[PDB]
From a paper:
Here cryo-electron microscopy analyses of human CE pre-B complex and B-like complexes reveal extensive structural similarities with their CI counterparts. The results indicate that the CE and CI spliceosome assembly pathways converge already at the pre-B stage. Add-back experiments using purified CE pre-B complexes, coupled with cryo-electron microscopy, elucidate the order of the extensive remodelling events that accompany the formation of B complexes and B-like complexes. The molecular triggers and roles of B-specific proteins in these rearrangements are also identified.
The antiparallel orientation of the two CE pre-B complexes in the purified pre-B dimers suggests that U1 snRNP bound to the 5′ss of the exon of one protomer may transiently interact in trans with PRP28 of the adjacent protomer. PRP28 is in the vicinity of the U6 ACAGA box in the pre-B protomers. This configuration therefore raises the possibility that addition of ATP alone might trigger PRP28-mediated transfer of the 5′ss of the MINX exon of one protomer to the U6 ACAGA box of the adjacent protomer. Cryo-EM of purified pre-B complexes incubated solely with ATP (denoted pre-BATP) revealed highly similar molecular architectures between pre-BATP protomers and pre-B5′ss+ATPγS, which indicated that a U6/5′ss helix has formed. Indeed, in the pre-BATP dimers, nucleotides encompassing the 5′ss directly downstream of the MINX exon RNA base pair with U5 loop 1 and the U6 ACAGA box to form a short U6/5’ss helix. Furthermore, stoichiometric amounts of full-length MINX are present in the peak gradient fractions of the pre-BATP dimers analysed by cryo-EM. This finding supports the conclusion that the MINX 5′ss that is bound by U6 comes from intact MINX RNA present in the adjacent pre-B protomer; therefore, a RNA–RNA network that links both protomers is formed. Notably, the PRP28 RecA domains are no longer visible in pre-BATP, which indicates that they have been destabilized. This result is consistent with the idea that the pre-BATP structure is formed through ATP-dependent, PRP28-mediated transfer of the 5′ss of the MINX exon from U1 snRNA in one CE pre-B protomer to the U6 snRNA of the neighbouring protomer. Taken together, our data demonstrate that the tri-snRNP of a CE pre-B complex is capable of interacting in trans with a U1 snRNP bound to a 5′ss, which leads to the handover of this 5′ss from U1 to U6 by PRP28. This result further indicates that the latter handover does not require that the CE U2–U1 molecular bridge in a CE pre-B complex is first converted into a CI U1–U2 interaction, as the former bridge is still intact in pre-BATP.
Author numbering:
A (entry chain A): 585 to 633
B (entry chain U): 100 to 555
C (entry chain C): 116 to 951
D (entry chain A): 245 to 438
E (entry chain A): 974 to 1314
F (entry chain B): 36 to 57
G (entry chain G): 273 to 329
């Protein structure tokens, strides 16, 4: 959201969400892309964000 | 059976004996069977084999010990009792038992009591040791100790004993420790010229629920009022007696004429009709007061034109102009003003005045330095009683007995106390360990805080 | 309600039993189930346990039992008679073993809770050993039977195998400690009871046979039960019970009639609620409403088991049949506990448990109210009746028939019977009960004997509470604000009353050290001190264990000391004691109360000592049971014996004092044999007084001990860890880091979990539980108990070693450090002065 | 999506209570989060070298870690203001869920150690002589003989016993899709190595 | 070796005029002394309010400094004691240096080994044998019993140093420091002057304490003898004064310097009042004021900045403050890549 | 190149104070 | 700062016991959420698998 919209520019507390969402990504990808599946843009588990 | 033959009475040194300390073992911190080593004064577990007293005796070669709870002397390394008359002075220092004749004679006593160290002193007027900057409690206790009826009531242990107390009651601990401390104060055979109230302060902290702490310098007025109410509550049976000792010593009857005041920003006709509506009319309420609160008048706040920067001085009668129908007092309560005017009904045998200092203003607390001018010799209070109740009363003359003064700002102040010795008529001012003879002429030349008067 | 008080009049319809077991073995849950059975208005929540009988904040928050709690409750029997039960809910944690003993001393019987899946474990073994020491009646309850069904899914044959293995192990352990063979345990005997306290299952063989009888009728449940365990089989062709299987693939009677119905009733509730549960529910007569069937699996299972098994009559009749009543069971209690013995008139009076006899109560518990400023005593009434608002005479731990100082006259106010959280006030309490007593807190310190004044002046006290473990952990405690030091001091007294084995000692430097058994024990102690008693901020030093002092070599030369009179000269020598002999004195195998012939026979025979030397033994070490010996060795050809006997006693006190406080580590000389090789006693009595001899005896003991090369004994804890197989290797490394050597690693039978028993130094045992739990991700759990003092590596008298600050020194340095810093903690000198 | 954890002993010092303790004590579990100090106490953080905390008097064998202080909040640290006591060790819930469906619900899995019933002492207990006096009525039977020991749903139900919170309830209420954190238990565990 | 640094709390405002006149007549012609004392008694005025300064002295008089110094000398005679003063000053014909003694015997005769007064900050350096220290402690505790060991609570310590470098508050050493302070306070009459404990620092070097901590002229200094706890006598650290004995000519001691917290506070206050008084002020004036303050601080506290990392942070922060103020003066918007030229 | 003044704590310890001055 | 500084890391340990946390086998049948089962099967130490095959008759 920060890269696509940049709405943090008008309320910086919103960055608290962004830093969370990115974190969730790092929480998911390294669980999503663990086995024979390599790093790539294939995850679609969007519930957390 | 080798008593009366102890070769260790020479080792006893009365200088190092401080019995004001709490009777707990120096190692096990136990209250049971406290034994003090007369050589060193430190308490121990008790007389027995392989006990702390035994260990101390076999280690430091101290052979004489005293049982705190028994008032009897023993030898631990040989473990035998001691029956001597020469040790009775130590027993009286630990447990001062006052007979009725000597209790009565304290009013007429005029001999300079001599301590072991040689610092001859007077009974009652004995320096109090401050611990953690709480001289207010020491001053209040010194003032209270000067009251003759209270002294008679508390000097003898059985006078305030043999009463029923609640099983979960801890207030009786304070009331029974006050007697112990005060009979230590009046003891004319103290080893040291001063008395340590530290145990009393600890009991006050224990019973006061963390208020009046040793560290904090609380108000003398609040501490005195709480102490009097607590002493009245403790004494008696499981149900409060109508006339306890504090009640018959300090409590008096006084009458309040409370009149509700309408809002001052009201039409005159509306104010009159509200007054006629029987809600804003005078009501008489009787009450019992332990003390009288004296409201000092407003400070000049400006330099005197002729002699600039003069400290205000008010006659005692202007303060006494309260408690009568002629003078009112518009109490400016935050909700609405009240027109309350007081009137005395039945004067107590002993009178307590509390001059209101440390008044919190709209932003902080400031101390009023106005001095009150009073005749120390005697005052007349018959003129401040209603005509209905002046027939019963016959003695309204009061003479000053105790005076409390606060020196310094409210943030950090010192509580000094002048006391009148009944035997000699002399006034003695004592501040912590300091004790000095003060002339009665300059008694009124101080910021009087609490006054104790006797009707005679 | 009045029947609860009236039942105390009969001394046979009361059972004084304590519930003891390992950590988290369902004891509290069992008491909760009993309360729910007897209290209609008390019900546990569906997911959260009832947590009844646990009233402390720490008890609920930590989840581990802390304070033993009294529960008085009336329960109907199997036949239908309402008996009265008093239960000690005791902590299962080993660190609170003392809390068991305070409830164990005043308990007639013991109910040992053992988890079905877990096994015996360590605290159960220690508990059965210690209860054998008081010779109490023993019953076993294998709780958490469901864990063999709903967790391991063991076949019922394997479940019977596991239960039989556990029962046999318990019986063998008891036979290894108790000589009396009458303590055999078997469910058919009414000893072993089965239970799952979460689902309110509580049945013995008799209870289940009675359930069968009520289901069918005209069935002798006693004789049916007497054939419901072991290698017995059932034949439906003849309806007959044989000692051999009627077929080849037949199942045993216990499996066939008990384990099988339980397995099916659990399976139909955990797997087939909506499909097959109504059929089997109507089959067994259990009628559940439509709403009741809508609950989750666990509340529904608890409800159906409550409806089926009904009352907890198995536990009740177990206690009735195997745990003696106070009236009949008082005699062994007086025989083992009272100091004066049953021989005296008071012993005979208190053995009968007469409500009209002399008043005598034994208080071993102290309970803190909300304020915490007035403790309440709790103890057993062993004779007479105590009345509310009555004067009593409280004795102390050091009281004897001579010393009347230890007593005190106190008025007892209102008194009540504690039913866990709520207690019922009663005007009086007859003999054999457990009572809370008010107004006696001030003279009572830990163990107390209360009697009536103005009568029975020849009344002694009961023996002091003996604890299984030796508290070795020591923590210094100071106030943050010294102006508030008295308050903390006051708080210390309170904790010293509250915790039976807590020892608060003020050292020379002014450090208030507190002795605790383990980490959790001291943690709870200081939580109580900060938050409940003192209510002021406190400071803790770094934890450290105590140390003992011993010798390893004979003293090079005989060391002599002289009185200040220079007329009494005592010369002694130092030697170590034999192996096990110190343990023999520790365990009261041999006592100073033995006549000289018996003790001499023991020493000469078992330990190959000289007969004269055995008769030459004078006294024991720091206490009557101290692990040090003082032995006379003055040759009669040079030293008079009768004259020496006059100062023998004074030399005994001097030697005891010397062993109490060692020259090296300031305390606790252990495993040292001292022989007096020369005695020059002044001919006049006044030149051989105690004040002269005792310091001389201390000096000569110190010189003899220091001349021989001394050693420091550090306590070694015996730690067993129950952990899965994969964590055993990690536990090995964790124990290797803290200088611990592994002894055994036995897989638990009937469970996939290993148990590793090892010895770890107590000084290195701090944080070991947390380390092991976090390192294996909570799979490996550990409990620590004191095992034995062992020589620390290093030489305490090698001054060429330099102690580097804030660094873990190697083993050869440790001893030096372990004493030097210890001296700094006592305020003592830098080095031990050999001259002094 | 579900962590296959049977009991909460995994979250010994990694639960809400431990994190509250860490926040209160101005320290942090290695795996735990870092918070700002609950109270600054900048001058009080480093007290003077008293005679009570004299490092000379302190015997060091193993460093006192943050985990020690958090586990025992009232023993290893000073002034524990607003601290929470972590739940102690729960019973080790060892539950072996079935892996192959073609297997009885009740079965001695090889994971469980073999009992290996010994007979060093021949098991002897007081029981009357065989088949001599006692004969039950023919109408008295075991309580559940018609019912089979275990259906095909028994193993599934037993597995459902020791399952995460949503999957151990026969019934329940309905929650919004917003209120369902599908990875809340994902970050509540320790971070995987490597 | 125990140091006491303190100050006469109100020596300026608690000097009696009559006593000052009498003491000045002792050293100067009575007309001059009377003139000076009467000059100290004038009317102090401000706006609409004025008063008569009759008790205190006026520090704004040109000769007032001399008065203060003379008065301080009197205080020294109260603290040192005349004999000890004559032992430190030396014979009138052959006076000694600032810190020197005629011989070792008179140096070791009395506990007071070093003493300086400055204007009102007295620094005394005692040496004590074990028996003398024990006797002083016993004498102090005789009139001030402390059963609860409360003497450690109200003990000022130099928090600016690490724990090991800071004073170690051992009970014996704390008691000795309190005893030394009480002994010094006893010599000075409570009316002619006063010395308050909280505005004082007593630092004792003994077996337990390896560092001697003192503070003078805005310098927080710590002396570490090389004999005990000096593993390396390094040289790279420029905040280190390699103290050298005048006989052995060896590096017996190591002196660590630090800028006092009061000096840092004063510098920050000066920069703050420079910045806040710049609404209508040329940039060059601001830069010149900052430059003057910086050279004063750095020249006065050279070798003491390096060890005071807080001072480095404060210096760079204040420099950034000055630059920000100038940039705001140029344009009302912060530059993104402003150059330092 | 930001134009901000950087704190030289933990910096330029390879240089003395008497250097770069004659 | 979109990302997170490496200095914010809290799992910095000098103790090898905490650096190397003993992974839980979950009785050889449990699986941590998210990770594919095959990778965990080929990653698990199979101590329980070895024990099972030794006790498989």
């Amino acid at each position: 959201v920060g890269q696509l919209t940049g709405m943090y520019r008008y309320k910086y507390k919103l960055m608290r969400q962004i830093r969370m969402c990115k974190d969730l990504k790092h929480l998911i990808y390294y669980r999503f892309n663990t086995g024979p599946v390599g790093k790539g843009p294939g995850c679609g588990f969007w519930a957390a964000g | 059976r080798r008593s009366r033959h102890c070769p260790y009475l020479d080792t006893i040194n009365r200088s190092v004996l401080d019995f004001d300390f709490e009777k707990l073992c120096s190692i096990s911190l136990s209250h049971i069977n406290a034994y003090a080593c007369l050589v060193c004064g430190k308490y121990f577990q008790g007389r027995g084999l392989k006990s702390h007293a035994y260990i101390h005796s076999v280690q430091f070669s101290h052979h004489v010990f005293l049982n705190l709870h028994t008032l009897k002397f023993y030898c631990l390394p040989d473990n035998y009792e001691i029956i001597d008359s020469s040790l009775e002075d130590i027993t009286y220092v630990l447990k001062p038992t006052f007979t009725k004749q000597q209790i009565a004679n304290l009013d007429k006593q005029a001999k300079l009591s001599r301590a072991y160290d040689g610092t001859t002193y007077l009974p009652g007027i004995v320096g109090l040791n401050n611990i953690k900057a709480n001289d207010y409690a020491n001053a209040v206790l010194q003032a209270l100790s000067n009251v003759p009826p209270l002294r008679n009531y508390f000097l003898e242990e059985d006078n305030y004993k043999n009463i029923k107390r609640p099983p979960g009651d801890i207030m009786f601990l304070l009331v029974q420790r006050f007697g112990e401390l005060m009979r230590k104060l009046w003891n004319p055979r103290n080893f040291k010229a001063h008395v340590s109230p530290h145990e009393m302060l600890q009991a006050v902290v224990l019973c006061s629920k963390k208020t009046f702490q040793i560290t904090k310098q609380g108000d003398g007025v609040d501490f005195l009022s709480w102490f009097l109410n607590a002493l009245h509550s403790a004494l008696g049976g499981t149900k409060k007696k109508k006339k306890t000792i504090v009640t018959d010593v300090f409590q008096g009857s006084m009458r309040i004429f409370t009149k509700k005041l309408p809002h001052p920003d009201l039409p005159a006709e509306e104010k009159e009709q509200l007054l006629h509506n029987d809600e804003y009319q005078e009501t008489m309420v009787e009450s019992t007061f332990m003390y009288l609160t004296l409201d000092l008048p407003t400070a000049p706040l400006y330099k005197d034109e002729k002699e600039q920067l003069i400290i205000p001085q008010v006659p005692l009668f202007n303060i006494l102009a309260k408690f009568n129908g002629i003078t009112e007092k518009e109490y400016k309560t935050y909700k609405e003003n009240f027109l309350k005017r007081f009137q005395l009904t039945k004067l107590p045998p002993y009178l307590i005045f509390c001059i209101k200092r440390f008044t919190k203003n709209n932003f902080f607390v400031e101390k009023n330095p106005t001095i009150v001018n009073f005749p120390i010799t005697n005052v007349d209070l018959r003129e401040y009683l209603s005509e209905e109740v002046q027939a019963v009363h016959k003695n309204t003359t009061y003479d000053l007995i105790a005076n409390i003064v606060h020196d310094g700002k409210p943030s950090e102040g010192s509580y000094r106390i002048h006391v009148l010795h009944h035997g000699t008529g002399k006034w003695y001012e004592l501040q912590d360990l300091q004790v000095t003879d003060i002339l009665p002429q300059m008694i009124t030349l101080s910021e009087a805080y609490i006054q104790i008067w006797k009707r005679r | 309600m009045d029947f609860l008080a009236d039942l105390m009049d009969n001394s046979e319809l009361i059972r004084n039993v304590t519930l003891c077991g390992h950590l988290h073995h369902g004891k509290t849950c069992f008491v909760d189930c009993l309360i729910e059975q007897t209290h209609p208005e008390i019900r546990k929540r569906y997911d959260q346990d009832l947590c009844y009988t646990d009233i402390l904040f720490t008890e609920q928050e930590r989840g581990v039992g802390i304070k033993s709690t009294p529960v008085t409750v009336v329960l109907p029997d199997t036949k239908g008679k309402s008996y009265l039960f008093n239960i000690m809910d005791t902590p299962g944690h080993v660190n609170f073993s003392d809390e068991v003993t305070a409830g164990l001393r005043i308990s007639d019987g013991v109910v040992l809770f053992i988890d079905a899946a877990e096994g015996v474990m360590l605290n159960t073994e220690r508990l059965i050993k210690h209860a054998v020491q008081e010779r109490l009646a023993v019953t076993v309850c294998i709780n958490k039977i469901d864990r063999l069904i709903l967790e391991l899914k063991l076949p019922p044959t394997d479940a019977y195998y596991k239960l039989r293995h556990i029962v046999d192990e318990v019986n063998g352990l008891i036979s290894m400690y108790s000589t009396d063979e009458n303590l055999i345990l078997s469910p058919l005997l009414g000893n072993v009871c089965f239970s799952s306290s979460q689902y309110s299952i509580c049945f013995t063989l008799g209870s289940f046979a009675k359930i069968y009888a009520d289901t069918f009728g005209d069935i002798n449940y006693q004789e049916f039960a007497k054939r419901l365990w072991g290698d017995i089989y059932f034949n439906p062709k003849t309806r007959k019970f044989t000692k051999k299987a009627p077929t080849s693939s037949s199942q045993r009677s216990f499996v066939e009639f008990i384990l099988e119905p339980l397995y099916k009733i659990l399976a139909q509730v955990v797997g087939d609620v909506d499909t097959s549960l109504p059929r089997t529910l109507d089959e067994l007569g259990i009628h559940l409403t439509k709403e009741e069937l809508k609950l989750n699996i666990r509340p529904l299972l608890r409800l159906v088991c409550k409806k089926f098994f009904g009352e907890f009559t198995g536990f009740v009749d177990m206690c009735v049949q195997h745990i003696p009543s106070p009236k009949v069971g008082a005699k062994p209690k007086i025989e083992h506990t009272y100091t004066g013995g049953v021989d005296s008139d008071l012993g005979e009076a208190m053995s009968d448990c007469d409500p009209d006899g002399p008043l005598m109560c034994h208080t071993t518990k102290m309970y803190s109210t909300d304020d915490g400023v007035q403790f309440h005593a709790f103890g057993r009434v062993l004779s007479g009746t105590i009345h509310a608002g009555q004067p009593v005479k409280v004795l102390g731990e050091n009281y004897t028939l001579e010393d009347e100082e230890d007593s005190q006259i106190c008025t007892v106010g209102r008194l009540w019977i504690s039913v866990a959280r709520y207690h019922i006030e009663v005007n009086r309490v007859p003999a054999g009960n457990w009572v809370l007593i008010e107004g006696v807190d001030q003279p009572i310190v830990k163990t107390a004997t209360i009697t009536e004044p103005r009568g029975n002046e020849e009344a002694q006290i009961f023996r002091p509470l003996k604890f299984n473990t030796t508290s070795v952990i020591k923590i210094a405690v100071e106030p943050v604000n010294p102006s508030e030091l008295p308050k903390m001091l006051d708080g210390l007294r309170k904790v010293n009353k509250s915790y039976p084995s807590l020892t608060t000692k003020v050292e020379e430097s002014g450090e208030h050290v507190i002795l605790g058994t383990g980490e959790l024990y001291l943690d709870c102690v200081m939580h109580d001190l900060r938050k409940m008693y003192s209510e002021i901020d406190i400071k803790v030093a770094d934890p450290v264990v105590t140390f003992c002092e011993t010798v390893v070599e004979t003293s090079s030369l005989k060391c002599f000391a002289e009185t200040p009179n220079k007329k009494n000269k005592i010369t002694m020598i130092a030697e170590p004691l034999e192996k096990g002999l110190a343990e023999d004195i520790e365990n009261e195998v041999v006592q100073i109360t033995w006549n000289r012939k018996k003790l001499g026979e023991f020493f000469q025979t078992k330990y190959d000592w000289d007969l004269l030397a055995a008769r030459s033994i004078w006294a024991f070490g720091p206490d009557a049971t101290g692990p040090n010996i003082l032995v006379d060795d003055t040759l009669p050809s040079e030293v008079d014996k009768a004259l020496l006997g006059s100062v023998k006693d004074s030399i005994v006190q001097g030697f005891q004092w010397g062993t109490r406080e060692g020259p090296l580590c300031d305390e606790l000389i252990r495993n040292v044999k001292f022989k007096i090789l020369d005695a020059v006693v002044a001919q006049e009595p006044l030149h051989r007084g105690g004040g002269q001899i005792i310091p001389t005896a201390r000096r000569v003991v110190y010189s003899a001990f220091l001349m021989a090369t001394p050693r420091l004994m550090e306590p070694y804890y015996f730690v067993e860890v129950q952990a899965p197989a994969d964590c055993v290797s990690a536990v090995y490394t964790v124990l290797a880091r803290r200088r611990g050597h592994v002894t055994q690693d036995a897989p638990i039978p009937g469970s996939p979990l290993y148990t590793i028993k090892a010895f770890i130094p107590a000084i290195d045992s701090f944080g070991f539980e947390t380390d092991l739990r976090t390192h294996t991700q909570g799979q490996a759990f550990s409990l620590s108990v004191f095992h034995h003092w062992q020589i620390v590596p290093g030489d305490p008298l090698d001054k060429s070693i330099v102690i580097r600050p804030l660094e873990p020194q190697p083993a050869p340095h440790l001893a030096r450090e372990f004493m030097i810093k210890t001296r700094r903690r006592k305020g003592l000198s830098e080095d031990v002065s050999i001259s002094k | 999506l579900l962590t296959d954890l049977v009991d909460d002993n995994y979250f010994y010092l990694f639960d809400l209570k431990a994190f509250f303790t860490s926040k209160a004590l101005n320290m942090a579990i290695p795996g735990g989060p870092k918070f700002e100090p609950l109270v600054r106490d900048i001058n009080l953080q480093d007290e003077d070298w008293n005679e009570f905390n004299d490092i000379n008097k302190i015997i060091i064998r193993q460093p006192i870690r943050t985990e020690y202080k958090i586990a025992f909040p009232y023993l290893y640290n000073n002034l524990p203001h607003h601290v929470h006591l972590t739940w102690y060790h729960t019973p080790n819930v060892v539950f072996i869920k079935t892996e192959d469906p073609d297997l009885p619900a009740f079965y001695f899995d090889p994971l469980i150690n073999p009992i290996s019933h010994r007979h060093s002492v021949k098991s002897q207990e007081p029981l009357p002589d065989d088949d001599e006096e006692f004969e039950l009525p023919e109408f008295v039977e075991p309580f559940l003989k018609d019912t089979p020991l275990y259906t095909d749903n028994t193993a599934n139900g037993i597995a459902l016993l020791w399952a995460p919170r949503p999957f151990n309830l026969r019934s329940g209420r309905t929650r919004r899709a917003l209120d369902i954190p599908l990875v809340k238990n994902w970050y509540r565990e320790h971070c995987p190595a490597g | 070796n125990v140091m006491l640094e303190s100050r006469f709390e109100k020596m300026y405002e608690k000097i009696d005029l009559t006593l000052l006149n009498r003491l000045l007549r002792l050293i100067v012609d009575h007309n001059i002394a009377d003139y000076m004392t009467a000059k100290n008694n004038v009317v102090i005025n401000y706006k609409d309010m004025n008063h008569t300064n009759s008790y205190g002295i006026i520090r704004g008089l040109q000769f007032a400094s001399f008065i203060v110094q003379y008065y301080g000398l009197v205080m020294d005679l109260l603290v040192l004691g005349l004999h000890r003063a004559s032992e430190m000053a030396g014979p009138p014909q052959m006076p000694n240096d600032f810190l020197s003694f005629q011989d070792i015997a008179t140096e070791a005769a009395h506990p007071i080994r070093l003493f300086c007064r400055y204007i009102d900050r007295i620094h005394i350096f005692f040496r004590f044998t074990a028996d003398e220290a024990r006797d002083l402690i016993q004498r102090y505790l005789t009139e001030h019993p402390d059963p609860n060991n409360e003497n450690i609570v109200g003990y000022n310590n130099k928090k600016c140093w690490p724990r090991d470098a800071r004073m170690r508050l051992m009970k014996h050493d704390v008691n000795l420091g309190r005893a030394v302070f009480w002994d010094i306070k006893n010599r000075l009459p409570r009316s002619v002057t006063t010395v308050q404990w909280e505005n004082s620092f007593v630092s004792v070097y003994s077996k337990d304490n390896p560092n001697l901590l003192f503070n003078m002229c805005g310098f927080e200094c710590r002396i570490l003898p090389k004999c005990r706890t000096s593993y390396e006598e390094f040289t790279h650290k420029d905040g280190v004064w390699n103290l050298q004995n005048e006989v052995t000519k060896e590096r017996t001691a190591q002196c660590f310097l630090r800028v006092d917290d009061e000096s840092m506070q004063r510098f920050h206050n000066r920069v703050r009042q420079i910045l806040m008084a710049s609404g209508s002020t040329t940039f060059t004036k601001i830069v010149n004021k900052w430059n003057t303050a910086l050279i004063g601080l750095m020249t006065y506290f050279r070798e003491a900045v390096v060890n005071t990392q807080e001072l480095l942070d404060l210096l760079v922060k204040c420099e950034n403050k000055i630059q920000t103020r100038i940039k705001i003066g140029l344009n009302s918007k912060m530059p993104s890549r402003f150059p330092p030229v | 190149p930001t134009g901000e003044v950087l704190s030289l704590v933990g910096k330029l310890e390879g240089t003395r104070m008497g250097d770069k001055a004659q | 700062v979109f990302e997170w500084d490496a200095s914010e890391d809290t799992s910095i340990d000098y103790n090898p016991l905490y650096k190397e946390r003993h992974q839980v086998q979950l009785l050889g049948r449990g699986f941590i959420a998210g990770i594919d089962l095959k990778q965990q099967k080929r990653e698990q130490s199979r101590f329980y698998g070895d024990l099972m095959e030794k006790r498989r008759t």
